[PDB]
Amino acid sequence: LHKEPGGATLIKAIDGDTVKLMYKGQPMTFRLLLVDTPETKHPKKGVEKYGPEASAFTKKMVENAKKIEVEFDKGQRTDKYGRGLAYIYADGKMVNEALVRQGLAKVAYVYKPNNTHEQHLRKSEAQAKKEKLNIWS
Template identity: 40%
Template sequence: MRRRTATLWIIGFLLLAAWAGWDLVPGELSGTPGRADLEGRVVRVVDGDTVRVRLEGREETVRYIGVDTPETKRPGRAVECFGPAASAANERLVEGREVRLEVGEEERDRYDRLLAYVHRADDGRFVNEILVREGYARPLAIEPNVRHADAFATLADEALEAGRGLWSVCER
């Protein structure tokens, strides 16, 4: 009788978990743990790896995960080599467009910016990846947001070998 009661409790719990949508099996098969994609419109490009996005009636500053473009707006510092070109490329890719944001496992950085992988909503192009592939950004792996770190490193190596973007004019 005890075994049957325990079995019924376990089955009941699993049914409740399934009904509630709980993710009991973390990892790739279950998608991004605990994260829903967000959609919004880019209202302003801040620089090569940061944008302002209108999400559900509010604006959020979004910092791209896994990439680092040369600086253009750091107070007290000179504009870095290829910074304006990286900002212009980001504008061409996303300014005024609808985007889908995959929020990182760590959702915010120390400046309270939302951390995300960014995809254009209309054609699905992966903006973070494009910036690295075309030589506008270097890979930047910061735990725990490292899902695409290996791919970004490979793309950066290819851009370096081909002399694309910043790799053609900036010191390494």
């Protein structure tokens, strides 16, 4: 994979795994690859436990970053909702992994070929589960 040249700027973090960014001068909604943070918006699931916590975590991490970078995987770059599918980095730390390492997201929606960081993220999930962190508490 390679990060896209430069970085994006934050417009609005919507919840733990979805953020709107100004990416190449276009406002874009991005959904984080290979993770799921708990739901806070859609009424069918309601506000899931650790949903508020995952949102605050993502928001702080992207708001305090000097540099936000976007890395696409090898397959499709947008999902069926028109959301960009990427690994997002806040000063070179992957948000997707940070969330999983905190037990604030589960590794989910693994669709080949978009699975380059799947084993890295599953190792972080394993560590959060053996530490009983948050979702795994």
